[PDB]
Symmetry: D2
Subunit: 387 residues, 4 copies
């Protein structure tokens, strides 16, 4: 079996005009040889292109790369992770359906499920999905989907994806997993029983902090076709230039992830043993609840995680006195980022959900990059040891 | 005129750069916890994350906003992103939408397949007749949605008239002005609440970008559109915004030529023995010319005309040397298309007949080539 | 005869994967089907590509466009106007050769001819090329080239390209013309007997102020081959993204030029009649020396020209209280630029050559955009009234 | 001492509008505040920009990254390696000067030095620079520069940079080193006594096969100024978009080089023990003449190197039956390339110089990528073991 590094570097497809790099198809439309040839493409008959919203060669190449690492039937790229999330949920849910989702999700996913879905007649319950029994207790005759993020952003709360999949499969619900925090090198939800695996490509997959994008991959040709049908009407698209950049970033994804994983575990162990640090939420630590599920169902760990200082003042002193880490939201970049969930990425999360999520002002989230780990640790150590 | 404004948009230069930089970035740095917290609460000036706001995209938004006379503008990944964000940001389960019966194929698909799955009642009706709008009206009607002139038939709706109905009755009016551009059609100026465009067409005009834009009359309505966009996720990429803003620098100048070329081409087709009929809003023969002459200050260059058979239309479309057989419109070069088997193939048969779309119709988008060269191209294809 | 607008909008070449817009080939290298195929391509046999420095399809597409408007045998694109100039001269001149150049040139052209060429053993004379007899007098047995800009940057001085070309033809010398200021819409030096016609694409051709690039076009197949051979070793390349932007800009070149021309003429007649202005150097003004040559040899005029204030203080006042016009170097953008040549574009030229050029602290160079000309005139009027 | 990985991920310079990624300044000109401010900038007084040919902020950020790893006084970026090479030689050499250059150089470098320089009155000798005595024997009163490429493209011939630097320093000659083949992670010629270190950025530094570019770095402020002075008149510029791409590629340069070095050595050892292979020219092999010098003067090895088959026919059969390696010129890309120097990269080199470069139809050059090394070795093995 060919390694994933080789696969990403040698993706299926013909070269265009013998170009070694795949060209940027910065075009809106494509030409027809004849009215019949154009009519046929519109009926899905024959090979070729029509209009970039329906399909763009550069974007399609990026889609093939993702599909090959997810083990999917097809992938669809989007203008953002949120575009991938919207199109993987609202392409299937309709008025009268029920959604069960994790109670600890990315802030704007909470916003989508909590503000927009109910306006479309979709019933939603945010549930502690780390407990299968609670998922089952929340099930109704009209449940059509379960949506999980694991490890969750930002607390790293782990859900039993396999266990929950069994229930979805027995009851006729789709299982959709946001695997953004771990990347497809380490988490392959289609192997664990998910029907759809999605990512904010803005994070690890692109890895270079210079693109916003999303991707979704489906186990079934029918589901990916439905997703793309939704996309053509809802219109969240990956631009050709952004696709070119995301494919290029993805060329180094396996080696970047290996370094992210190792650096993040070492930073977590350093923080864990430090006097100033109360607790560290990294799913690769033996102290972490759900470490056992995470080590069985994933093949590695992303390097974004959260830790608890003794006070909000202590957290602010740390965050404001770093020279290598950069104070900023987002994650999964080559350089290390740090932020304060309570007042930033999760500050829009309604108060009842934010306390069920366990987000307090003492918490700091760090997204460890690929800098030399000793430099990262020395930067944290000097700030923690300030006068 | 409009040109000076588009060339000299408000804002500071970034590091004294004459061209506005491409902010190819996802995230932005904070000076402190407080400054970041403040930005998330909408206080102070600055950026957080490109999905919430990118300086390059905002520059393009400001350009459109200035020309629409709006309170604000939002850019998207496509015209469809603009459309679904300008409708589903407001409509919810139990609401009713009245839409023009003739729309772009994918707008039909959105209103016809997706909106009712979300419990929104939709009636497509003939909006060229205001009394028909009044008759479709219900107590739960919250929006009327119009294209005018419509794609592909160029059917004209009375925007000013329908806006009066909407204002009186507590409903938003949303107008897709793609086919005409904000040089010649300003729906907010006619009483509309929202004006939107596929920027992929005239506004960018160089056939190398897909993008959308929507502009709201009120600050609250643009804030709601952007709130939806933040969760729905149809963004204009910074490189595409750089390209759209650049394309828009020649917009007024391209439109003058598109308009004049389109009129001359339509007239040539209208007196040609082989052509049954020409649907161009600027022709005296076209039904709705009087309304369009009054409500618009010019005409786009994309219109439809009728051949005597499918075979005759196939022969025309397939023997052109300058015009390109392709979908889309509003590019600098001339495009030509067959609505029945292409742009509108997926439109349900019943909606198809109601639109009046038959296999004998050909749709053309006249570029800014010398008119005589394009007339000569059509001439040899129609005669030989 | 198909019109230039149509020609630029419908360039020769097949589509790539049916794409309407020509793709951006952001690649360094190309794949071969076989050893023999790669080897054949290195020998110039067969069709295809090897490596973007030798040839990039996106760049070649921009090259084709320029070659169509110039009526050339071929065109080469570069990373700047200076790259086109260097490669159009040093590809031919060698130690012991003599070059005759116009006395009024872009500042960096002066620096090239005056600092670099003599280090390479090439003799250079800067002479007043508005008088053909002065070209004849400057001639030597080793003269191999005449290099001209017309109208010259920044004074707009006009040379008789057509007359100078006869002399060059008669005497075995190449005539190279930098037609940056006028664009290939209105000035086609190869039609006037020049051997090479070149531009800073950074100006009108691209026209959107967002790219630096050059292009050179040769009358003969052998000369454009030599230019590209020099380019391969010298390495001033147009990037694929910049070529994409330059072709795109060029799609509107003819309509943009038409407006530049009309606008600049109107601005110049306004300034010529205003009491604060000593003279206006626009080659389209009947008052201008060499207007009659420029009217015969060109089919229109660029919109960059120079005018004279009563003092340096007046110049400074004007340049610093404009609200639409932007204080910046460069020219031929969609929007109006304004510049002080003495201390900016031509600051580095030796006092000696500057004297010869007629450049003084009282001169101001404007590059009129495609704004509503009433807004530009109103901007100027407003500033002149303080 | 902060690691190069961290240094490259954290370049000096203010952020622009708080942007985390450095913006692409796709502009030709810049605005002045006043006639004086603009006049001042043209005299080198004050901070700010004028025109992209003279300086562009996105390009300057890439220059500063290169300058930080070379240990230079300044770096200059160009449209191609050839642009860097022209500007690093013709900026200093004038009519009547003498240049000593290696006899085994990149083909177009031979073209520059043997066709163009002599046309400008510059005297040039191509010398075997692996022998310092031969360098000295070729020295003349007017010698002004020694130009070296080590290991040489394509034969990997090693020069003694340190030993040749002594002679340059004693006699008033500039030493210029093309370090393209090794990257600035492993070869820092300014530390060995060179005056100028340059690269085709098209190769390892960018690493992604999608840009052509050059860079040159000088030990002295005066020499970098002269180079840039030459650049503004010769006009070989890095485009803003290409500088954005090269800086982005360079963010992963240290980890890519580590994988390239290891893969390359393992592939060379596989080939060296293989029955079909006569000889392997990898400077990290103990059998390689020059290994001892390469091992002392570099801190690693690039992964492009040459090997000898038993025949031209055997070479062609190998090169045309690979499924992972790609038949193409260029090198230092993330994916593996392969090429026939005798009929491709070096087919334009005069037979005189080809004979002494040691280039024959039996030689194949491979540029080993970052694919899993077992997948690379398996691909070569299956082609070598063909019916
Ligand atoms: C509040 S601003 C910070 C951006 C951000 N997160 C994004 C993200 C998305 C959304 O992906 P888009 O950003 O649309 O590409 C989806 N799914 C997950 C697990 C995510 O972490 C953050 O910093 O936590
Ligand atoms: C596959 S068919 C080609 C596209 C096309 N029309 C598009 C269009 C859109 C949608 O805009 P987006 O394509 O999403 O930027 C919105 N509004 C109007 C009046 C439109 O005409 C056409 O060829 O009629
Ligand atoms: C002082 S810096 C301003 C640039 C400028 N002129 C440039 C120019 C070039 C050089 O072209 P490149 O800039 O290399 O694309 C060549 N030929 C002519 C007639 C030129 O005017 C100016 O503002 O006068
Ligand atoms: C003219 S071939 C250029 C590519 C590169 N310099 C090589 O050695 O492969």
């Amino acid at each position: 079996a060919q390694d994933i590094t080789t696969t990403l570097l040698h993706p299926k497809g013909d070269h265009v005009l013998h170009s070694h790099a795949y060209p940027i198809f910065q075009t809106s439309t494509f030409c027809f040889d004849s009215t019949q040839q154009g009519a046929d493409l519109f009926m899905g008959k024959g090979e070729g292109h029509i209009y970039s919203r329906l399909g763009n060669p550069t974007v399609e190449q990026f889609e093939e790369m993702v599909c090959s690492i997810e083990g999917a039937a097809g992938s669809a790229a989007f203008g953002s992770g949120m575009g991938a999330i919207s199109s993987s949920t609202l392409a299937f849910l309709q008025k009268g359906d029920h959604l069960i989702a994790g109670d600890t999700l990315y802030g704007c996913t909470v916003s989508l499920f909590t503000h927009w879905l109910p306006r479309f007649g979709i019933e939603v319950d945010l549930i502690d999905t780390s407990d299968v029994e609670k998922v089952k207790a929340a099930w109704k005759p009209n449940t059509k989907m379960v949506y999980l993020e694991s490890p969750a952003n930002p607390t790293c709360k782990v859900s039993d994806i396999k266990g929950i999949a069994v229930v979805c499969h027995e009851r006729g619900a789709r299982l959709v997993v946001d695997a953004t925090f771990t990347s497809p090198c380490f988490l392959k939800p289609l192997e664990l029983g998910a029907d759809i695996a999605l990512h904010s490509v803005s994070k690890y997959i692109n890895g270079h902090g210079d693109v916003i994008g999303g991707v979704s991959s489906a186990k079934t040709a029918e589901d990916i076709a439905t997703i793309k049908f939704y996309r053509k009407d809802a219109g969240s698209l990956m631009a050709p230039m952004d696709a070119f950049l995301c494919a290029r970033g993805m060329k180094t994804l396996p080696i970047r992830m290996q370094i992210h994983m190792e650096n993040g575990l070492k930073v977590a162990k350093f923080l864990e043993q430090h006097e100033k640090i109360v607790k560290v939420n990294h799913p690769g630590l033996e102290s972490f609840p759900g470490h056992d599920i995470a080590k069985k169902q994933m093949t590695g760990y992303g390097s974004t995680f959260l830790f608890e200082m003794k006070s909000f003042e202590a957290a602010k002193k740390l965050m404001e006195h770093l020279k290598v880490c950069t104070l900023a939201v987002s994650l999964g970049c080559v350089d290390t980022l740090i932020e304060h969930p309570a007042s930033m990425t999760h500050a829009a999360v309604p108060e009842n959900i934010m306390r069920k999520q366990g987000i307090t002002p003492e918490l700091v989230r760090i997204s460890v990059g690929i800098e030399n780990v000793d430099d990262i640790i020395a930067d944290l150590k000097q700030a923690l040891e300030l006068w």
